[PDB]
Design a protein around this ligand. Structure first.
Ligand SMILES: [Mg+2]
Ligand SMILES: [Mg+2]
Ligand SMILES: [Mg+2]
Ligand SMILES: [Mg+2]
Ligand SMILES: [Mg+2]
Ligand SMILES: [Mg+2]
Ligand SMILES: [Mg+2]
Length: 71
RNA sequence: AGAUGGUAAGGGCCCACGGUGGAUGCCUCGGCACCCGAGCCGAUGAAGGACGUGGCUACCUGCGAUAAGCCAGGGG
């Protein structure tokens, strides 16, 4: 995951506000999708959940830095 | 016609072995003292808190809806 993690910061850093907010919306739904399965059992690869929870944290963290001057 | 042994419901003392109870000894993640060092925080919202936060979490810790963590530099 470490590797596939050092990407976002880049593949996500170069997009802008309107590109992220929508990307994050997408992720947030996926997270719902998950926590929605466990409640019934299905999904069990926890690693997935926490893994997605932290992704959003990054997108937001990156979007927060962009909204401070730029253009 | 004489006689002092003897019964132990229980009791008493001595011994042996246990039960209880946690003194004693060694122990120490703790406290105490003195001496250095360092000495302020907040409406850029403090001190302290409430509630929440884990795939399953009662409590503690850590965190804050980015919630046991997010970005970057440094050490390893
Ligand atoms: Mg007699
Ligand atoms: Mg008897
Ligand atoms: Mg005992
Ligand atoms: Mg506070
Ligand atoms: Mg807590
Ligand atoms: Mg839950
Ligand atoms: Mg490093």
């Amino acid at each position: 995951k470490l590797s596939e993690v050092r990407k976002q910061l880049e593949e996500a850093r170069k997009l802008s506000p309107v590109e992220l907010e929508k990307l994050v919306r997408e992720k947030k739904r996926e997270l719902m999708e998950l926590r929605f399965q466990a409640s019934i059992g299905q999904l069990s690869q926890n690693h997935k959940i926490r893994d997605l929870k932290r992704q959003i944290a990054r997108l937001l963290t990156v979007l927060n830095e962009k909204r401070r001057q730029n253009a």
